[PDB]
Symmetry: C5
Subunit: 209 residues, 5 copies
C-alpha cells in the first residue's frame, strides 16, 4: 500500500504535467540549451574520404516553466524519468556530419521539479575532417559545430558549462590520443538573415597513439 | 507571476494558430498548380568510387513553396509572423534525385518554417550516392557529373520547379574536402517526352570537380 | 474560393473512395497486374559472392472497379495521388534477392478515374548472379524472377506490355553495358502449394564497358 | 457482375471481421509448428570471422481453432491472405545467428478454413560457422539450430515434414555447391526443468564449386 | 466440442490475468521511494571479430535480466492455476541496461518476449551482437588480449536501480567451439562509479574477457 502510494503520486504528477494547457520556443518565449560533450573515443579516421568517426555523450539541459511542480503537492517527488518522446526536445544537430548520427543509448530524460531537463544521448558521428598530420607529433585538428537546425538565437540560445570537453571517460587504448578538446559557444551573423545564430563549436586535436 | 502569464499567453496564441491551420490541402492539381523553388548548398564531395562509378555528395536542399491554406493575419494571432513545425504536419513536395544508387540519407531534423503569407521553407541536409564516372578527377581539367532532381508523380502541369539562381551555393563547401569544386550549377530544364503530352520539369545539378 | 472548390472536389472524391463498403484479390475476384522493368544501372558485380547490384524502375499497373469514378460527378477530376501505404498494392517480390530491396523513390500511387492504378518505384536490388564472362565479348547472363510472394495465379495473374526491357534510360557511363534484356511471363509450381504461381523473369546479358 | 464482385468482397470482409474479433500457446493449449527450409544460396563463407551467410525460405505451418470457419457460411471462401501482423506467429529463432535476420519477402500469411496458417518468410542469415575444408573435396560442414526462444516443448511442439532440406531452388551458379542439407528434429531433456525442449537442426555440408 | 470449450476456457483465464495485470491502477518504473534490484547474468556465445585497425571487437552474448515487482504478483488459484506466462517485452516496464562503451547500436538477435511468474518475478533474456571499444593487441599471443565493457542503467542511479550479479562467472558453456577466438577468462563484476553529470552514484556490471586467436 505504501508502494502503491508513491506510485500513484508519480502517476498523478506525470498525468498533471502531460495534460497541461508546449509548442516549442519562440522569440516571445525563448529557451537556453546548455550543451556539454564527453568524448569517449575517436574510432576511425579515414584519410581517403576525410571523414572522422567520434563516439561521445552529448549532455543537453534546458528549463521549462511548464515542467515545474512543488514536490510538497506530489509526495515529495523531486524528479522522474520519462521517454524523451513524452516531452519537447531541442533539434540540436551536427552541422557537418556525413552520415546520419547513430544513437547508442536509450532516449530517456530526467525531469526535475524546477522544470529543468537533462537528456544525454550517446552517439556515434561521422563528420568532415582532414586527418593529415595525425601520424605526427603535432597531430591533426578537426572541428564540428552543433546547434539548432531551424531555430535562431532569438528562440534558442546555447551555452556550455565549461570550455573544456570532458575527457575523463576517453578510451585509454584508442588508436588516437587526445591532445586537446574544447567546446565553445559561437555567435554568428549571416548575411541572409536578420537574426543572430548560435552554435557550439567542438574542436579536437589528436594523433596516433 | 505576470511574466508566467505572458509566456502562457504567447504559447496559447501559437497553439491556437496551429490548431486553426491544421483543422482547415490535398497537394497540387492541374486546376491548382504549385511552384516549388529549389536551391542547393553543396557542403562536400565525400567519395568518388571509380570501381562502381558512384559519387557521394553532402548538400542542403532548400525547398520553398506557398499555400493560401497556410496564410494568416498576424493581428488575429498575437502578432505571430511564423512558426516551426514538423514536416509531417504539412504537405511536402516529392522532389527526388533521378539517378541515385542508394536511398538518400537525411542528416537533419525534418522541421519546416511556415510564415504568415503562407510560404513554407524546408531545408533537409542529405547524403546522396549517384551515378557518376569520376574519370579525369585526377587531372587539372577534373571530372564532370550531373544528376537531375524533380517530382516523382507530378508533371509540369501540377508542379512547376524554379531556381532563384543557376549558381549552386558554395559558400559552405568544406575547405579540406578531398575534392575541390571547379563549378556547380543548378538549371531548370523543361522536358517533352514522346510517351506523354504533358511537359516535365527537372533541375539539373552539374558539378565539375577534381582531387585537391 | 475557386481553389477551395477544386480542393474540396478532390477531398470529396478521396473521401467517397476511401469510405466505400477492397480486401485484396480472391479466386472469385482475381486481378491482373501489368509488370514492366526499365533498367538504369548495373552498379556492381561481385564475383566473390556471385551477387550483382541493379538499379531499375519497376512499373506496376492494375485496375479496380472500386477505384472508378465519373469525372463529371467530381469536378472533372481525372486522377489523384495517394501514398502507396494508404491503398492495397500487389506484393511483387524478387525471388532471388540477397539483401532487402532498397527503395530510391517516394512510394506514391497514381489513381485514374477508370480505376487503374500506376505505381513505379525506383529500386536497388542485390540478387544471385554469377558474373563469370563479364570481361569477355560474350559477357555474362543472369536472371531474376519477380512475382506475388503469397497470391497464386488464381488471385494475381501477371502480364507484360512488351518482352523487351527498355534500355534508353540506362546509365551511359556504367561500368557495365547491356547486351540484351528481356522480361517474360512464367508459370511455376512449388511443392508447398497446389496452385500455380506467376512471375515475370528478367534476363539480362551484360559485360564490362 | 460489379454486384457479384462486391458480393464476394463483402463475404471476405465479413469473414475477416468475424475472425479478428489468442494469448499464444500454453501447457493447457499447446501448439504444433511444422518447419521446413528451402535453401536458396550459400552467399558468403567468411573464414576471417567464421560466419556463413545463408539465403533461404522458411516455411512455418500451424493451426488454431480460433481461425477455423465453415466455407458454407462465407460464400464458399476456403482461404485468404492477411498481414502476419494481424495474427499470432511463433517466435522461431536461429540459436546461433551473429546478425539480425534480414527479411527478403512481404510478411503475409495464408490462412485456410481448417484454421491452418502457412507463413513463408524469405531470409538472409549470418550464423556461426567455421568454413575450414570448404576448398577441399570433402567440403565444410556447418549447423544451426532453430526453435522457440521462450516456449518449451509443452507449449510449442516443433515438427518437420521431411528431414531433407528442399533444394529445388538452390542457386545453380552459387560460389558453393551443396553436398547435403538436412533438417532434423531434436528433443532435449534437461535436469533443471520438467518440460522437454525442441529444436530443428539445420546441417549443411558444402564446398567451393 | 467439450475440448474446444476447455481450450477457450484456459485462453480466457490467461487473457483475464493479463488484462488484470496490465490495467492495474500503473508501474511508472523505479524511484528512490520504490527502488528496484536487477540481477544480470551474461552468457558469452561468440567473439566474432577483432578489428585492430579501429580497436573494436564484436561479441555475441545473451544478457539475462531478472527483477521482481509487486504489481505483477497473482494468486494462481484465482486465475485457473496459471503460474507463469509469456508476453511481449513492450507490454511491461523493462530496465534500460546499456553498454557504456559500444561503438555501434546494439543489435538484438532474439524475440523481445519476457516471462512473468506468479510471484511477480520477470525473466528477460535478449541475445545481442555488440561492437565495443577494445584493443586486440596480443590476441595472437599465448597471453592473449584483455578487454572490458560496463553494463548499467542509462538513466537510473543507484538510488533507483541497484544492479547485482549472482556469480562472477560468465557462462561459457554455450561458447562457439570453432570461433576464431578462444576464451581464456570471462568475469562479470558489480561496480559503483560517479560521473560529471550527476551527484548520484551509477551502478554497472563490468564484463571482462581475456581471449586469443584459436
Ligand atoms: C505461399 C505463401 N507464402 C509464400 C509462398 C511462396 C512459396 C515460395 C515462392 C514460390 C511460391 C511458393 C510462391 N511464394 C514464393 C507461397
Ligand atoms: C543521467 C541521465 N542521462 C544519462 C546519464 C548517463 C551518464 C553517462 C553514463 C554514466 C552515467 C552518467 C549514467 N548514464 C550513462 C545519467
Amino acid at each position: 500500500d505504501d508502494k502503491l502510494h508513491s506510485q500513484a503520486n508519480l502517476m498523478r504528477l506525470k498525468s498533471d504535467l502531460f495534460n497541461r494547457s508546449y509548442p516549442g520556443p519562440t522569440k516571445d518565449d525563448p529557451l537556453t540549451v546548455t550543451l556539454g560533450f564527453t568524448l569517449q573515443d575517436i574510432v576511425k579516421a579515414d584519410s581517403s574520404t576525410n571523414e572522422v568517426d567520434l563516439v561521445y555523450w552529448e549532455q543537453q539541459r534546458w528549463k521549462l516553466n511548464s515542467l515545474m511542480w512543488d514536490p510538497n503537492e506530489y509526495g515529495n517527488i523531486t524528479d522522474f524519468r520519462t521517454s524523451a518522446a513524452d516531452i519537447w526536445t531541442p533539434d540540436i544537430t551536427a552541422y557537418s556530419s556525413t552520415r546520419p548520427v547513430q544513437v547508442l543509448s536509450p532516449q530517456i530524460a530526467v525531469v526535475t521539479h524546477d522544470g529543468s531537463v537533462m537528456f544525454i544521448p550517446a552517439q556515434r558521428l561521422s563528420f568532415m575532417c582532414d586527418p593529415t598530420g595525425v601520424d605526427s607529433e603535432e597531430g591533426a585538428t578537426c572541428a564540428v559545430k552543433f546547434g539548432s537546425w531551424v531555430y535562431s538565437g532569438f528562440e534558442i540560445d546555447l551555452k556550455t558549462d565549461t570550455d573544456q570537453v570532458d575527457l575523463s571517460s576517453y578510451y585509454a587504448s584508442s588508436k588516437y590520443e587526445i591532445l586537446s578538446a574544447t567546446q565553445t559557444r559561437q555567435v554568428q551573423h549571416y548575411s541572409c538573415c536578420p537574426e543572430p545564430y548560435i552554435d557550439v563549436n567542438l574542436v579536437v586535436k589528436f594523433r596516433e597513439r
